[PDB]
Design a protein around this ligand. Structure first.
Ligand SMILES: NC[C@@H](C(=O)N/N=C/c1ccc(O)c(Br)c1)c1cccc(Cl)c1
Length: 338
């Protein structure tokens, strides 16, 4: 009943913000530009510093014209509307949002520890306890999101930041969507796509549980279970129902992975009558204190090294390009609700 009441309150609070989203809560000239932290085909993520408080933030800047051209309008509206409405210990917080003549802006908490992707590639692979610590946080985060009728749709190491306590902060909600029932958009990242996405089916939250299987495999092995030069070759492996496990994987890990990487979505853990409890009660998680993880009381396997809230040493170097704001409004109608 404790979990039920928790999720009931979580949904109440989410829906109130969902129905009345915040808008226009800062402006660009409140911030100093520090560094480019990431890029995409229609925007960039910057480290910025607020000029009055001195606080650092990560500012995602999306070019409205490129969002229109790449048919990402709905996805960008989803992203901001969801982010401003959610609240969970392992989700990055949206602090401000605004738009101008050219761009959309989401100003988020800055996590100086960097992406799990970098740490995993540096270390090689995580031990099972280390992978399990991160996996437990994703399980709880998906329990939360799915209870709000939200599908995340982009789980992968690049989207998981490691905070000062060594815990996960999920970011990059660009494909997240509120869905009752099924949805159809082809989106995600190839190595992490469930078979039903590849096969152009109507799909549901089970795709997130498939992606968790991919993530756990990748964390524990050091490479993803389905890999190839061309996406088509990846997709053939995904739909085949065949995966090879390293000998060092425990029996419990292999068993959990066969049930998450279940090609038949009607038999996949997380999508059965017992829902998330088939995962939480699996033997691989027998040592996990779910409440202690939620309360951030478990000592983390790994604390990223950084010097302070402005340190960027865990992020990569990108060309520093101008961020121009047109003298004239672009695509105003399309982004009215942002
Ligand atoms: N990796 C690529 C990704 C990215 O860099 N996201 N970073 C988010 C972030 C949030 C909060 C933070 O505290 C930190 Br630090 C980083 C991306 C880049 C450009 C456009 C788009 Cl749509 C997505």
């Amino acid at each position: 009943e404790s979990v039920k009441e928790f999720l009931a309150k979580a949904k109440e609070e989410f829906l109130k913000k969902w129905e009345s989203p915040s808008q226009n809560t800062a402006q660009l000239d409140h911030f100093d530009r520090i560094k480019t932290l990431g890029t995409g085909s229609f925007g960039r993520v910057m480290l910025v510093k607020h000029k009055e408080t001195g606080n650092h933030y990560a500012m995602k800047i999306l070019d409205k014209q490129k969002v229109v051209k790449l048919k990402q309008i709905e996805h960008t509206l989803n992203e901001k509307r969801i982010l401003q409405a959610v609240n969970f210990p392992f989700l990055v917080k949206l602090e401000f949002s605004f738009k101008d003549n050219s761009n959309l802006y989401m100003v988020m908490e800055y996590v100086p520890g960097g992406e799990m992707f970098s740490h995993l590639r540096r270390i090689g692979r995580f031990s099972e306890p280390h992978a399990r610590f991160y996996a437990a946080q994703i399980v709880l985060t998906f329990e939360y999101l799915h209870s709000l009728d939200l599908i995340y749709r982009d789980l992968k190491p690049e989207n998981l930041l490691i905070d000062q306590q060594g815990y996960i902060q999920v970011t990059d909600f660009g494909f997240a969507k509120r869905v009752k029932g099924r949805t159809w958009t082809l989106c995600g990242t190839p190595e992490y796509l469930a078979p039903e996405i590849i096969l152009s089916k109507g799909y549901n939250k089970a795709v997130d549980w498939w992606a968790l299987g991919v993530l756990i495999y990748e964390m524990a092995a050091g490479y993803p279970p389905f890999f190839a030069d061309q996406p088509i070759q990846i997709y053939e492996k995904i739909v085949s129902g065949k995966v090879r496990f390293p000998s060092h994987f425990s029996s419990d890990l292999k068993d959990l992975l066969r049930n998450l990487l279940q090609v038949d979505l009607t038999k996949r853990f997380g999508n059965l009558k017992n829902g998330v409890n088939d995962i939480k009660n699996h033997k691989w998680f027998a040592t996990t204190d779910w409440i202690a993880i939620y309360q951030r009381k478990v000592e983390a396997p790994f604390i990223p090294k950084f010097k302070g809230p402005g340190d960027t040493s865990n992020f990569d170097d990108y060309e520093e390009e101008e961020i121009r704001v047109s003298i004239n409004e672009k695509c105003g109608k399309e982004f009215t609700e942002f």
